[PDB]
């Protein structure tokens with residue numbers, strides 16, 4: 001809309017480009033996304049406007065004009081990928097990691113309770129502000145409408161057509177590990193490299209740990225068989241409570257994977273607080 005003055009491109013996705021923009025008539029600063037128009041898309045996106053929660057980036061307006069689709073979102077000041085890179089030397093303080101994980105699980109528990117999945121969680125769509133808040137962005141968009149495979153759940157990689165809310169828990173678990181170790185957990189650069197990286201760390205799944213896995217669409221009996229490795233080796237700095245929680249977030253069987261709601265009650269969050277991040281914007 002000519003109702004906005006584009007300041008700068010704050011990113012790009014496959015579902016569209018995102019810009020920092022100012023509302024030409026109200027001076028308000030926002031994140032303007034021009035979607036890259038079916039009625040179903042319009043209806044699903046319209047549903048997202050009501051899905052409001054303190055840990056979900058607010059969708060301010062939906063502008064379907066001149067047969068185009070623009071999404072006006074609230075503008076935060078930093079995404080988690082940049083914050084992680086900037087904190088690479090010391091690493092994000094554990095209390096902050098815990099706070100962020102707790103908040104994101106609250107956001108997920110909320111959307112999941114409304115049957116809405118994100119499907120593509122990653123540091124780039126997790127936005128933070130100076131007050132210690134972290135929020136889920138660009139979600140509900142996947143189902144409504146190089147791509148990184150690093151946070152993709154194994155059931156999606158094995159070809160499951162109807163995945164559940166568990167896919168989000170898996171992605172968040174990978175991000176949790178990344179914040180703690182300062183290295184991506186499963187940095188695959190292809191679908192099979194991604195799958196095998198997961199197998200080499202958590203062990204090749206079988207019917208014992210994941211009933212029904214061998215009949216999944218893309219499963220091959222020829223998959224090499226790797227043994228699982230201790231979480232003590234995978235996320236060393238993390239204490240037992242965090243390790244136990246992470247292990248339940250990375251269960252192979254989606255039905256065995258912990259829910260966001262249950263994760264909130266895990267002992268790991270017994271001492272959760274809300275520290276302020278060291279931001280440089």
Ligand SMILES: c1ccc2c(c1)Cc1c-2n[nH]c1-c1ccncc1
Pocket residue numbers: 010011018031033057073074075076077078079127137138
């Ligand atoms: C989709 C929907 C809303 C938003 C985004 C993507 C990215 C984004 C969104 N809102 N604010 C920001 C942002 C702020 C500062 N630095 C990077 C990004």
